[PDB]
């Protein structure tokens, strides 16, 4: 059960959320924010790793897209 | 005209084809693929049009197609790195 | 092969043509308009292929194209509602 | 100067984020998430509006793309 300094802006933003029916409490709103923070932080690492892998995969230089489609359709 | 195409990226088309063919049949799988083809062929032509994501990774541009996003950079020619689902997208920090 | 086109979405194309034409020239503006054409002609051919975004707005699906995103619904036919820059994307709440 | 209960989970995420180079304290993390949540709520309002606006602008039935493209670039 933690203690946090929020300024007026978010003081108020939390209340616009909780007086509306979005969330039942301050704590629930902050959890919602954190969740999005965590989700993005993790999509973001996933993305960079995915791109590195692409870089390390090496290259095809002459790609025949018409034939990729042919062959995939044949299968 | 010319671009390079990472093996992983090519594994991406393969997986894209698999899901599509399974969800919708070959016709549709083939249609969606030509769209990826067109997106890519246009990146090759007009490299500068792709939106940069320099905070994601140095030298990178993205160009969307359907439900997917083409990630590329340009060295001595245009390099297609990954073709990934839009569900992968994330805001990069400055 | 028909589809309904909202007039705001036609103004979307116009705004888009102007921007890209101003930024990159007519050859390029016209080719980008063509990517968009193809996206929309495929949304029409196969409407079920756009990713639904039912939490955004009931009945709505999207199909991205280059730097843009076609949002549509289907009534008696596919109706193209908007064509919006991808920086407008948002995470719909369940 | 508020007061809240997180998950064990979010408590630890905050802990790790703070102990990476990422933020200077729990409050800064909490606000980062709040900034994200607010932003996302704005964009959603904008997007729904852009869409309503489309719904309410009328409809073309016979759009010729090919002719549109020629027109804009004769």
Spell out the domains of chain C, with CATH numbers in brackets. Answer: 1-94 (3.30.2310.20)
Return phi, psi of residue A19, to 5°: -85, -40
Name the CATH superfamily for A7-75. Antitoxin ParD1-like (6.10.10.120)
- Residue C88 is given by DSSP the state G
Q: Which two tokens stand for residue C93?
A: 């709440």
Q: DSSP for D28-67, please give it.
A: HHHHHHHHHHHHHHHHHHHHHHHHHHHHTS-EESS--HHH
In a mutational test of the A interface, the residue from D3, D25, D34 whose CB has the highest number of chain A CBs within 10 Å is D34
Return phi, psi of residue B64, to 5°: -80, 150
Domain made up of D7-74: CATH architecture: Helix non-globular (6.10)
Residue bearing tokens 């063919």: B21
For A47, A66, B67, the CA distances from A51, given in Å and listed in that order, are 6, 25, 18
D2 touches chain A (CB under 8 A): yes
- Could you give the residue ranges of the DSSP H alpha helices within B2-76? 7-24, 26-45
Residue bearing tokens 């409407």: C47
Q: Which two tokens stand for residue A64?
A: 């025949």
Q: Which residues of B touch A63 (CB under 8 A)?
A: 3, 5, 10
Experimental method: X-ray
**Cα A27 from chain centroid?**
21
Q: To which H or E segment does residue C81 belong?
A: strand C78-85
Question: Interior CA angle at B7 toward B6 and B10, to 5°?
Answer: 90
B90 touches chain A (CB under 8 A): yes
For A22, A55, C18, the CA distances from C94, given in Å and listed in that order, are 11, 36, 36
> What is the nearest CA distance from D25 to chain C, expressed in angstroms?
27
- Mutual angle of helices B7-24 and B26-45, in 10-degree steps: 150
The answer to whether the Cβ–Cβ distance between C49 and B35 falls below 8 Å is no
C-beta of residue B83 within 8 angstroms of C-beta of residue C64: no
> What is the nearest CA distance from C51 to chain D, expressed in angstroms?
16
- Measured from the Cβ of residue A42, the count of other Cβ atoms closer than 10 Å reads 11
Q: Which of D22, D24, D31, D23 is nearest to D2 (CA)?
A: D31
Q: Which residues of C71-87 are buried (b: 16+ CB within 10 A; e: fewer)?
A: bbbbeeebbbbbbbebe
Kindly give, in sequence order, each residue whose CB lies less than 8 Å from that of residue C44, ignoring residues fewer than 6 positions away: C1, C2, C3, C77, C78
Kindly give, in sequence order, each residue whose CB lies less than 8 Å from that of residue C58, ignoring residues fewer than 6 positions away: none
The answer to whether the Cβ–Cβ distance between C17 and D72 falls below 8 Å is yes
Resolution value (Å, 1 decimal): 2.6
B6 touches chain A (CB under 8 A): yes
What is the C-alpha separation between A55 and A57, in angstroms, rounded? Answer: 6
Q: Which of C70, C81, C6, C11 is nearest to C37 (CA)?
A: C70
Kindly give, in sequence order, each residue whose CB lies less than 8 Å from that of residue C12, ignoring residues fewer than 6 positions away: C82, C83, C84
- Measured from the Cβ of residue C56, the count of other Cβ atoms closer than 10 Å reads 20
The 3 state secondary structure assigned to C25-71 is CHHHHHHHHHHHHHHHHHHHHCHHHCEECCCCCCCCEEEEEECEEEE
Alpha-carbon dihedral B69, A69, B24, B80, rounded to 10 degrees: -10
Q: Is the dihedral of CA D45, B92, C53, B63 positive or negative?
A: positive
- Mutual angle of helices D26-55 and C7-24, in 10-degree steps: 120
């Amino acid at each position: 059960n933690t203690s946090v300094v929020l300024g007026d802006h978010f003081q108020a933003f939390i209340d616009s959320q909780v007086a509306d029916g979005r969330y039942g409490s301050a704590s629930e709103v902050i959890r919602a924010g954190l969740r999005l923070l965590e989700e993005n932080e993790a999509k973001l690492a996933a993305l960079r790793a995915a791109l590195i892998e692409g870089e390390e995969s090496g290259f095809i230089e002459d790609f025949d897209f018409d034939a990729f489609i042919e062959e995939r359709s044949r299968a | 005209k010319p671009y390079r195409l990472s093996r992983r990226a090519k594994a991406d088309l393969d997986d894209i084809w698999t899901y599509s063919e399974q969800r919708w049949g070959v016709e549709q799988a083939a249609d969606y693929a030509r769209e990826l083809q067109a997106t890519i062929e246009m990146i090759a032509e007009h490299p500068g049009m792709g939106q940069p994501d320099e905070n994601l990774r140095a030298g990178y541009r993205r160009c969307a197609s359907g439900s997917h996003v083409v990630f590329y950079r340009v060295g001595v020619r245009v390099e297609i790195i990954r073709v990934l689902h839009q569900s992968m997208n994330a805001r990069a920090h400055l």
